[PDB]
Enzyme design. Structure first.
Site, PDB file in Angstrom:
ATOM      1  N   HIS A   1     -34.401  -7.371 -78.390  1.00  0.00           N
ATOM      2  CA  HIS A   1     -34.056  -6.556 -79.420  1.00  0.00           C
ATOM      3  C   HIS A   1     -34.939  -5.402 -79.977  1.00  0.00           C
ATOM      4  CE1 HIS A   1     -36.777  -9.255 -82.269  1.00  0.00           C
ATOM      5  NE2 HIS A   1     -37.066  -8.113 -82.690  1.00  0.00           N
TER       6      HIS A   1
ATOM      7  N   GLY B   1     -42.848  -5.920 -87.456  1.00  0.00           N
ATOM      8  CA  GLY B   1     -43.860  -5.437 -86.608  1.00  0.00           C
ATOM      9  C   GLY B   1     -44.420  -6.453 -85.877  1.00  0.00           C
TER      10      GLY B   1
ATOM     11  N   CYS C   1     -42.949  -9.005 -84.124  1.00  0.00           N
ATOM     12  CA  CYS C   1     -42.106  -9.720 -82.871  1.00  0.00           C
ATOM     13  C   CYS C   1     -42.733  -9.136 -81.446  1.00  0.00           C
ATOM     14  CB  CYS C   1     -40.579  -8.842 -82.885  1.00  0.00           C
ATOM     15  SG  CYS C   1     -39.744  -9.321 -84.396  1.00  0.00           S
TER      16      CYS C   1
END
Ligand SMILES: Cc1ccncc1NC(=O)CCc1cccc(Cl)c1
Ligand SMILES: Cc1ccncc1NC(=O)CCc1cccc(Cl)c1
Lengths: 304, 304
Positions: free
Chosen positions: A41, A143, A145
């Protein structure tokens, strides 16, 4: 003496954290050998998020669109591919700090340490467990991830989790390092409700053994039970059913303490039925389920 | 989303851990620049332990009697001295992995991470606090002495604790990196009872703010209180008295949430007087006091 929620030393994993930016999105990546692993993503905008076609979005991306920075220095991306929900960015340089490692897919009930990161920089380390509903109860902000979960066996880091998302209920979902989500979650901004978060019975029993070893013994009673009788109580209290495999894994704790596994089940049954009565066990006023039998043996023996 | 007992990433400290052996005793040492810091009780036998005269025992020791090993390689000891309850072993090689560092002496209520070690090898990392009675509730076995406590401000490690002993009650005592014990403890195998382990009120309030930020709001009530009224309740429940300094440090949390510090005190007062009624806050069934206001801001903002 003492028993703490203990994480693995994070240094080996800190040496792998990098920052990955694609377009205007920045998250964390994991650099092992000449490959950087990150959530796919990273290629999405705040419009793609609702129903992204990752294969289609990736067609518009080239190697030079993935900016990978390790500390203050930039890595050259010479290849990219999507494997399930992760991207693998081939870089021209092997990470000199690559530890010995494996990628493992863990089962619910298993614990691991998380090195929470932002902009490729580590902020903290904590211990958690893969819940029976395949969520994790972490501490992650936007932030985070690409932050990873791992276990360490002497010198080998077994990576088991990569952070991808937060459900609307504040619980967390992610993938193994092959990009496959734990549970039924998808990397989409859609309605994804979690199932029943049942208690990890074998872990509670392991933690009761840890309490006995550390001197907290008030909950030991004069009773015993059977697996079937105990499981009737476990079902009532949303606890996972205990199996002979679980009894077997508690063998070393039973051997060290001299408390038969079914006797400890009978103590747990009484705690479920009567509550703690304002008392505590290992500084907790609830039954802790994020220590496995292996964690208890490790901490109680001083394995490095 | 989520709030966890989070430790600092331990890598910078892992790079400093060494093994120190004197005679038949082995513990941990901390290698910074060309000096290795360790508990002075490394020179004691199981006969010296009752009433050791450290200055006298040290006369029988030379540089070559202190064996210092960093990984599988031996460090050459070219000097030694005793500073309070620690030994400083000057070695011929500066630790190439020495991070930027400071030695700080913390106050009760302050939290820090511990990197538990055995034989100079890290076993785990956990977070704890300097209790108001100057003990710490750690997880340490024989061989863990010399393991250190620390905080990190971006790239600077502030070392605040070195592990020396376990009291007969299973709680832990140690020194700052200048060798001065926290509290009245002495490095002797003698009767050393700890004082009242009161609750760190300012930390409980900070953790209640963290709960509100993370969505656990059931405990917020329609009341307010004064510092003097709140402190009457705090005294009754063995909580530290709250001062205007504590109210001031909670200012950013009050500003972010819009909940006045005295209103949060009134919620805490009701929780003290009524209990939790079988409910939980941030996954705990008791009031957590080992998160400072700074820890809550750090974790809730993602500081790296
Ligand atoms: C905000 C946050 C907080 C903690 N952990 C993680 C997150 N972030 C998310 O959940 C991202 C959700 C997402 C899914 C698929 C595509 C896109 Cl563009 C976004
Ligand atoms: C056994 C243990 C467990 C956890 N943390 C620490 C320890 N170890 C101790 O308390 C050592 C006590 C001591 C004091 C002064 C001299 C000598 Cl020889 C020994």
């Amino acid at each position: 003496s003492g028993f703490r929620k203990m994480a693995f030393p994070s240094g080996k994993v800190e040496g792998c954290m990098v920052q990955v930016t694609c377009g205007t999105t920045t998250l964390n990546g994991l650099w092992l050998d000449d490959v950087v692993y990150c959530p796919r993503h990273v290629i999405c905008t705040s419009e793609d998020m609702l129903n992204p076609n990752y294969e289609d979005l990736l067609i518009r991306k080239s190697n030079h669109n993935f900016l990978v920075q390790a500390g203050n220095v930039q890595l050259r991306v010479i290849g990219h591919s999507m494997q399930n929900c992760v991207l693998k960015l081939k870089v021209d340089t092997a990470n000199p700090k690559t530890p010995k490692y494996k990628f493992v897919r863990i089962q619910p009930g298993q614990t691991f340490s998380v090195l929470a990161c932002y902009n490729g920089s580590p902020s903290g380390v904590y211990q958690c467990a893969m819940r029976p509903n395949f969520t994790i109860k972490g501490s992650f902000l936007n932030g985070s991830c690409g932050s990873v979960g791992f276990n360490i066996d002497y010198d080998c880091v077994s990576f088991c989790y990569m952070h991808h998302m937060e459900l609307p209920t504040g619980v967390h979902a992610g993938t193994d390092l092959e990009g496959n989500f734990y549970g039924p979650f998808v990397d989409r901004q859609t309605a994804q409700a979690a199932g029943t978060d049942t208690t990890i019975t074998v872990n509670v029993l392991a933690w009761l053994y840890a309490a006995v070893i550390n001197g907290d013994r008030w909950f030991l009673n004069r009773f015993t039970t059977t697996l079937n009788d105990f499981n009737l109580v476990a079902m009532k209290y949303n606890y996972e059913p205990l199996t002979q495999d679980h009894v077997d894994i508690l063998g070393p704790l039973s051997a060290q303490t001299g408390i038969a596994v079914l006797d400890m089940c009978a103590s747990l049954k009484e705690l479920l039925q009567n509550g703690m009565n304002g008392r505590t066990i290992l500084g907790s006023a609830l039954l802790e389920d994020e220590f496995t039998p292996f964690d208890v043996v490790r901490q109680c023996s001083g394995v490095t």
